[PDB]
Nucleic acid binder design. Sequence first.
RNA 1: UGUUUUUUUCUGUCUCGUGCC
Lengths: 66, 71, 258, 59, 47, 105, 115, 54
Amino acid sequence: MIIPVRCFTCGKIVGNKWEAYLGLLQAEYTEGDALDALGLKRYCCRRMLLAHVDLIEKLLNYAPLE
Amino acid sequence: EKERFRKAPPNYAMKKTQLLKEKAMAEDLGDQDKAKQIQDQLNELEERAEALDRQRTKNISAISYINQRNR
Amino acid sequence: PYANQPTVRITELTDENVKFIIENTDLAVANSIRRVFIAEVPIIAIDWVQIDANSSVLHDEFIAHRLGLIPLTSDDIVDKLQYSRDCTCEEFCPECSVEFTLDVRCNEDQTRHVTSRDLISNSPRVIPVTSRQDDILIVKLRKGQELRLRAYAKKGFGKEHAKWNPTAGVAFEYDPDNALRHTVYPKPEEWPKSEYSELDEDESQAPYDPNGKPERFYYNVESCGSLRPETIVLSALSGLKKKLSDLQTQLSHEIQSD
Amino acid sequence: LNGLTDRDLCELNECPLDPGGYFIINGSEKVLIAQEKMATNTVYVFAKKDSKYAYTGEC
Amino acid sequence: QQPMIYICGECHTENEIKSRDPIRCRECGYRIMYKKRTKRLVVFDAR
Amino acid sequence: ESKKGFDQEEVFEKPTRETCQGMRHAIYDKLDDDGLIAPGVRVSGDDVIIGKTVTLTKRDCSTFLRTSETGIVDQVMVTLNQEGYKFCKIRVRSVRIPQIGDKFA
Amino acid sequence: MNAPPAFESFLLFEGEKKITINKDTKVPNACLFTINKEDHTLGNIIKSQLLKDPQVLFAGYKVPHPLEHKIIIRVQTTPDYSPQEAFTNAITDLISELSLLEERFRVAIKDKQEG
Amino acid sequence: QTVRISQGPYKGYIGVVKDATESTARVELHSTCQTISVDRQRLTTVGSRRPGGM
RNA sequence: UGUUUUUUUCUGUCUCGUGCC
Ligand SMILES: [Zn+2]
Ligand SMILES: [Zn+2]
Ligand SMILES: [Zn+2]
């Protein structure tokens, strides 16, 4: 639903990188270069930005008030 | 007495108000009443779209943009 | 009937990781030092969250779970504070804990991104990794929601929970050329060469060596951001020394008692 | 919810991803399993052996 | 002196509901309404 | 709640230690005076979840959390059913930490 | 519901001894050292350090059950060298080696920074 | 009543006393889904009141 | 020349469906 704070296998902090990953994919960069531009060398931490689904947006669509 | 003065669109009844207006328009066979109901529904839809755009200006819109360019 | 004189040589010293080499030592000592790097390293982390009003969409426990994984810099604080279990007082005393506070409420129309920056700590040096790169996103709030809470941090080690695991991943490797035959490749030509392999590109693996001990153990301790890598190594070695000393004291007491 | 935009669905505590097509009886999602049977108005000639007839023209 | 404060369904407006009363909101008028978070010491361990 | 009979009648109310004859050996002051537990409150196995008492003085005809559940109340909703009686639903969450024996595939 | 806590892996319980010595009866000069609330970290290094000593005829540990936190170390030395002093010497000199490794690593770090 | 463990390994947890005796008392932990039997002297009442009421 | 309390295993019906070894 939301980006984890650390990689399950390794433990490197990946929570502070989803927004930056989206921005780098936004500008011109593609995934294969964005991942190593962010600083993810091991393949275990790269699933956190590829396999993650961002379901918090749909949840936020159901605003309680206003 | 509360809803008499209290304006209706606020806040979560936007879909309910739109459905009620559409039902009233369909039920009413008159021309002026149907036109007024259609205009009210269009105004409510525009207000809802503007409110969503203001709320979804960041993140919710950028994620759509990145998804569309990625596909 | 005594031990050896190991040597150390740092190949790369940065503020994110260190690559050092230990020579003239036994494999068991190297593996134990690695496992201490991962498990038994004192470090401060969030372990007690008091939530007063959480109107977000996620679970009540989800906030605490995410807050527990936020690293906290403890360069000179972990050595001073004492374990909460061994404290001699009541309530989380600042002498043996660090207090945190978070009070964010999305008032404007746009959605909020509650990051680790909102954690206002009472102590100056105990802060999340934001000093000197974006911040760890905790949750997302929308107009009408809020998140008020206060948490306390304590000292722990990875053996208790993964929140106290400073090292990201330790790249432990010894004997790059398969000289001791500790692994048998069915087709050596099909394997790539190790990063630290000194052999040329022609031969696939070094020849067999009967009278050969494992030495020259390579390390790539990678800090998550809380503790410095060399600081991690020093703390781990000091903890292993303390454990050895305590074991020796207990053994001496047991022998004298008999 | 006939041809209704995702905005209203989200505002009505629903999702656009729900396939739908299920009744709601006493607050419980009820679905009708599609039963299959033998096609009508078609002549079938079986050869039941555990009987006195060699062939049977069912329809 | 607790008047059992409740929260409306869609309007999310605070309502004071006592025993032997219909469960309806002070304006508009609906039938769905939730309760408020307890005032107890909700303390979790971030484990 | 529902009207069982001319003399029988259900109502949400904390079953006290004095007036209610039928009663369980469990904690009751955990919930508020309405008879519905507040959200975000500790419950465990064999704990009162709703304060229903039927008059015969009253009988504790209230349900309890099933044994070996040990969860937390998420939210409490109250309404009327088609008949017009007070109808309420309560859901209890539980953080299931993955432990050995859980089935994976 | 009955998952054990996290502190029962390192913290001693009231009445539980950190180390217990038990002499074996099958062969002379052989004792089994039972360590409580520890893992392979504190047994493998001692095993290897004992292996270095030539007077130690037998040296090796085990884990009776992974969920349970205990290790048994069996030591057998020459009849003119008790296993208690063997264990003490191994611990002492291992501590010395670790301290020397610390000092060398520290000086290497301090030299590496701008040097 | 709500109590708080002030000494021992569980120092810091919050729970409600389920069954109490002359020496020990069972307290259900808030976070974890498990009930422990900690000594009564290890507990400290914190209570949960609501001052005001006007 | 004096010192205020003793009550305790309850309990629920018949039917249908789904999943697992
Ligand atoms: Zn990884
Ligand atoms: Zn203290
Ligand atoms: Zn109403």
